[PDB]
Design a protein around this ligand. Sequence first.
Ligand SMILES: O=C(NCC1CCCCC1)c1cc(=O)c2ccccc2o1
Ligand SMILES: O=C(NCC1CCCCC1)c1cc(=O)c2ccccc2o1
Ligand SMILES: N[C@@H](CCCC[NH3+])C(=O)O
Ligand SMILES: N[C@@H](CCCC[NH3+])C(=O)O
Ligand SMILES: [Co+2]
Ligand SMILES: [Co+2]
Lengths: 495, 506
Amino acid sequence: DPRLYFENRSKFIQDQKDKGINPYPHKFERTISIPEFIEKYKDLGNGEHLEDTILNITGRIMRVSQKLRFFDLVGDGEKIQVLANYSFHNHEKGNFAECYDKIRRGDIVGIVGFPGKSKKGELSIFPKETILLSACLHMLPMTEIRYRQRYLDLLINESSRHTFVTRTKIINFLRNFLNERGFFEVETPMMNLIAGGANARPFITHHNDLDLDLYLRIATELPLKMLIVGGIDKVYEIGKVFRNEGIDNTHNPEFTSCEFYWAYADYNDLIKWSEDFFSQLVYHLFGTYKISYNKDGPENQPIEIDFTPPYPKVSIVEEIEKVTNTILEQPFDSNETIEKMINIIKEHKIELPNPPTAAKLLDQLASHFIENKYNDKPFFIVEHPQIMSPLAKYHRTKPGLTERLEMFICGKEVLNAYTELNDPFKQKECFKLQQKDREKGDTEAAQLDSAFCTSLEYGLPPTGGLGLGIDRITMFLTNKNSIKDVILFPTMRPA
Amino acid sequence: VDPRLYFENRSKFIQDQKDKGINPYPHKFERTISIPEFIEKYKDLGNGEHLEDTILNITGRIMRVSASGQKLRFFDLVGDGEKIQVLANYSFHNHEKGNFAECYDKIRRGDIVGIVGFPGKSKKGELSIFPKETILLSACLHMLPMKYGLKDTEIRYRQRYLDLLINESSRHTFVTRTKIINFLRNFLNERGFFEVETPMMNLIAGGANARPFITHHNDLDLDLYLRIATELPLKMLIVGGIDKVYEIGKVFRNEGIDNTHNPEFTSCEFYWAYADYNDLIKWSEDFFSQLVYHLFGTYKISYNKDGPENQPIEIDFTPPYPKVSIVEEIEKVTNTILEQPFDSNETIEKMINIIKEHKIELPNPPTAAKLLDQLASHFIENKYNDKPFFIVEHPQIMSPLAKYHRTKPGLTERLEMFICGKEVLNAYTELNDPFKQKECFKLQQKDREKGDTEAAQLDSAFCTSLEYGLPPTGGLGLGIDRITMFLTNKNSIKDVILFPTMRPAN
Ligand SMILES: O=C(NCC1CCCCC1)c1cc(=O)c2ccccc2o1
Ligand SMILES: O=C(NCC1CCCCC1)c1cc(=O)c2ccccc2o1
Ligand SMILES: N[C@@H](CCCC[NH3+])C(=O)O
Ligand SMILES: N[C@@H](CCCC[NH3+])C(=O)O
Ligand SMILES: [Co+2]
Ligand SMILES: [Co+2]
């Protein structure tokens, strides 16, 4: 019974206290970490002892096994054995049995001792003195607990640490990749008067002193472009954005994105950037371009994803048309075209979007016909209609379309990029269209950001911009089917 | 000369260019060299020297327009904070692309252009691009304000891009900000620390004494608080065995704006298992000294504490830095004895009287913690100006998350570093006894009931995590913005935040 175990440990602490002992000492000066210990002494011979090498080492006890006490000691994801021998015990410090009888699995300890190997060749610390540094009062397990008590996940599941180490490696790699190419990292506000730069529902909060409602950012696009106007010609931000919508395996309402803006680049530069970056990232982590991924569960058959460039480009209107044996004529929001798309939707028994605006219909069609086209490789969906893409520049040869690219891995979007719309005339127009779409009941529609439009009037150079979803990328590169598995503290309802 | 009319004429110009079949916003210009690279490559040409067979593509923003008769047009071209001259000579113009004068007459200050041309120096020895063809890439439709015409205005903060374009020091300030953060991240990574991200939205806002922002997730039907600190989940990661962990990112404090307060700001917090107070002081002295030396090549900086028009003072970041015990110091400068418990009637009355006589604001409610805090802020925090210093050994009632001092009853092992009277750093040996932790939370709660809306609220998830064993640990926080203010010579936090928090424009 856990409750009783805990009661007993609490009374152990209190009893230690009454008897004038400090069960939470302030400082233990260790001389070596456990990984460093393993590195330095793993070449010892069986039974060999370095008894004149006195070391101070700390760690968490994870195993407890009568003049010979055995323990497993863990630190920084690595483990050594603790071999307490009566014959080595410093008797001046207290009773051997009393000392080691008190130790429980989970306890954090400080050890003064020497390095050796057991006769069986197990690398070990041989204590002359062991000190309790911090007691574990519950029973450590030997579920939702992983997400609510991530510290348990990290202590017991060795794979957890590796997953988050990989996450941090991915972000380090991205930062270095951008910095080596002359990009300048900035911070832009997380609280805005207006939430823009994407089509999503915002979080709203309130500043008391200004008596002002503020929106948490849904993207970093607009202030970054404003910085390009300011002459920071290669600029980027890695940080949190917030989207007030439901939780599922590929959606957390706060997630980490990276956006960069690259003056004098366009669509083609961005496609090349994407292929270079993903192929190089994957090679950096694996030394190969092919990884395996369990798209449908940890014990079902994995598929192989090949990150060898180049990647397929699939124009969205043309592909929808081709797989529906239909023709979707412009204006895409004409009665005939809207009717046609609605009919395609109802015919294939897929959810009719509410409201059924042209953009929402197109997006639904793409979702159901295109986005799962390839699973064995990343691919781009390209040349999105202008009505789906209010911030992307019109396509230089294809009326009605834009110079946009979205990259997908196993049917999930991880990347969105385009040649940037930089004519303020056209931008105000796009904002008007977006708003009349909000008037139809579309609550994810873009609102007019006058500060941003004003900045366009001062001259935005031709520019290419790109956004990455760090969490989804991490999912694919650590073999997780749920985004909860790559965020340390995913958003959950109180227990 | 009217800006409105200027803008109307410019917009009409765009429309007419389109009508005449010209695209005034080209999709792609493929340049072959940047302006800094052009300067590096060709700055050593002799006067009057032309490299007329070296044809280059270059882009930039026009920042000056001048002419000389019919066949000479002069411009200043800027990019990446550096500047070259454009010398458009009729002699070199590619007449196949259009009329020379018509082409260059259209160009205005602020226009972004693409130039096909050759490098050279004028006979006066100005480094120049000599266009054969100049292409408009993006028009500036407003009149750009000129240098020093952008002072004493909010324009800098609402239209940061104008600040960046026009005031050269601006770029430098924000570059230095990014260099400081790079330096910090590298400093920690080289010492074995592991960078993580913890949630910005939480069921409870803990880890500091501050009023939070509140928001709402619709789908879970759930109120959430923006984080006021990163302390609690990072300590939970220490429990989890990530023994050197840190985060650099935004935190949110729902309070008023002034020269050292923006409602969102950037902090770094790190947690260091098996370290304590003394390690934290050393880390601080090492970090600040090495940072300053890395940016300046010296340990001493000048700082216009009182604005650009009054004399600067000099700050010496040469370690070590003075340590000042808070209670002993308040006692010493007020001729008082502040006996424990600090919340005792006698002691509270003593502090209320000290505050009354020195004519300083009385906190509401007058809890012992807030009184001591007010006394400290009035009497200690400006003890030194020519060097950073630490205030140390804060009472436990001021310090709900800090471990009791190992030899001094009622105190904690805490340190705060101040530069010119401003806190930039808060650190301590971490409280890792869950029993004591719940005690401190209950005390805080009783302060909350008595009107202190900044009191620490109980975080059961955190306390429960302490029950699994938090090793002895040292923790530390830095205010990136304030640090940057001191290292870029700014008196206002708005000057080091690209887009500081503001009310809506007209
Ligand atoms: O990774 C995500 N998206 C991929 C995007 C990210 C922004 C930059 C373009 C690529 C992503 C991740 C999410 O967790 C998420 C949650 C709610 C709504 C949308 C969400 O999107
Ligand atoms: O830099 C600031 N404080 C220094 C602290 C920051 C957290 C880590 C310890 C050091 C700071 C900066 C602010 O802008 C600010 C705004 C509102 C309330 C408090 C604010 O504090
Ligand atoms: N803001 C975009 C990413 C950048 C698109 C290119 N300007 C998004 O959230 O999808
Ligand atoms: N959370 C602290 C910084 C770290 C203190 C050491 N645990 C603050 O906001 O001041
Ligand atoms: Co989509
Ligand atoms: Co204070």
